[PDB]
From a paper:
The enzyme, pyranose dehydrogenase (PDH), from the filamentous fungus Coprinopsis cinerea (CcPDH) of the Basidiomycete division, is composed of a catalytic PQQ-dependent domain classified as a member of the novel auxiliary activity family 12 (AA12), an AA8 cytochrome b domain, and a family 1 carbohydrate-binding module (CBM1), as defined by the Carbohydrate-Active Enzymes (CAZy) database. In the catalytic cycle of CcPDH, electrons are transferred from the reduced PQQ in the AA12 domain to heme b in the AA8 domain, which acts as a built-in mediator and transfers electrons to a heterogeneous electron acceptor. Therefore, CcPDH is thought to be involved in the extracellular oxidative degradation of the plant cell wall.
The AA8 domain of CcPDH was determined at a 1.8-Å resolution, and the final model was refined to R and Rfree values of 15.7% and 20.4%, respectively. The asymmetric unit of the AA8 domain crystal contains a single AA8 domain (residues 21 to 215 of the full-length CcPDH) with a single b-type heme, 2 2-methyl-2,4-pentanediol molecules, 1 acetate ion, and 155 water molecules. AA8 proteins fold into an immunoglobulin-like β-sandwich with a Met/His-coordinated b-type heme. One disulfide bond (Cys138-Cys141) that is conserved in the AA8 domain of CDHs from various filamentous fungi was observed. Asn140 is glycosylated with a single GlcNAc molecule, as predicted by the NetNGlyc (version 1.0) server. The heme iron is hexacoordinated with Met83 and His182, which serve as axial ligands, and coordination distances of approximately 2.4 Å and 2.0 Å are observed between the heme iron and the S-γ atom of Met83 and the N-σ2 atom of His182, respectively. The main-chain coordinates of the AA8 domain of CcPDH closely resemble those of the AA8 domain of PcCDH, whereas the amino acid residues surrounding the heme are different. On the other hand, Tyr108 in CcPDH is conserved in CDHs and forms a hydrogen bond with the d-propionate side chain of the heme b. Interestingly, Glu162 in PcCDH corresponds to Arg181 in CcPDH, which interacts with the propionate group of the heme, which results in a local positive charge at the heme binding pocket of the AA8 domain. The crystal structure analysis of the AA8 domain of CcPDH revealed that Arg181 is located in the heme binding pocket and interacts with a propionate group of the heme, making the local surface positively charged around the heme, while most AA8 domains from basidiomycetous CDHs have a Glu residue at the corresponding position, and CcPDH is the only family member with an Arg at that position.
Numbering used by the authors: 21 to 215
The structure:
């Protein structure tokens, strides 16, 4: 399970899943219903060892038929891509999601971070069908421990199969916050990673 986690780099709090084998983290912030009504978006965080190749998720758990987001750092430059697989095969580029890389992204030489806004990312056809407003969500996580996408300058780069991947359940309502807009602004305005 993920827990509420203070991001010391930015002062914001995420619902964070820390994976012990990879030493990577997957953080999410979702908008509320009390304030900031339209919830067709969330903020994500991919964080891991600076030497890792790429870090990704599945928004419906299964690799199959759910938005797959994949982030990496090309030198010092963060990248992010939305993808879609109909089986256990190299995913294709998925249009639908609107992705914005936010501040505190890049590398300090110890960690890499990709902090992102994902709009139009909570409803889709197939798989889980979307991220529920309330109740349980199952997310996937995926990680390549060593090797960057083949052409790391291109957000549509081909990539090698993850060295590690699995799934976990979490309470979506616990990841929702009326602080969402404040958090979004704060993260957008954070400078890039440098240490
Ligand atoms: C060359 C590309 C890829 C291939 C051939 C591939 C293949 C597979 C295979 C065979 C599994 C079954 C479990 C395992 O053996 O690890 C799996 C699981 C998974 N993959 Fe991929 N994968 C690829 C890329 C991706 C990407 C880019 C993501 C998302 C960023 C992703 C997300 C997952 C997740 C979450 C699981 C675990 C849940 C499930 O079993 O469906 N994969 N993948
Ligand atoms: C949002 O995503 C869906 C795919 O899940 C797509 O059909 C639609 O065109 C996208 N909408 C916008 C407004 O970009």
């Amino acid at each position: 399970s993920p827990t509420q986690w203070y991001d010391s780099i930015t002062g914001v709090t995420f619902s964070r899943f820390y994976q012990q084998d990879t030493d990577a983290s997957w953080g999410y912030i979702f908008p509320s219903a009390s304030g900031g009504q339209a919830p067709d978006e969330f903020i994500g965080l991919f964080q891991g060892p600076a030497s890792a190749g790429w870090i990704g998720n599945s928004l419906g758990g299964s690799m199959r038929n759910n938005p797959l987001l994949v982030g990496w750092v090309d030198g010092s430059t963060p990248r992010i891509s939305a993808r879609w697989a109909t089986d256990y095969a190299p995913p294709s580029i998925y249009s639908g999601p609107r992705l914005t890389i936010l501040g505190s992204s890049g590398t300090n030489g110890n960690i890499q971070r990709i902090v992102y806004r994902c709009q139009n990312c909570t409803r889709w056809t197939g798989g889980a069908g979307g991220i529920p407003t309330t109740g349980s969500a199952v997310f996937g996580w995926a990680f390549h421990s060593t090797t960057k996408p083949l052409t790391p300058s291109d957000p549509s780069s081909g990539l090698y199969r993850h060295s590690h991947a699995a799934q976990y359940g979490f309470d979506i309502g616990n990841a929702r916050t009326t602080l969402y807009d404040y958090y979004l602004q704060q993260l957008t305005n954070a400078p890039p990673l440098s240490g």
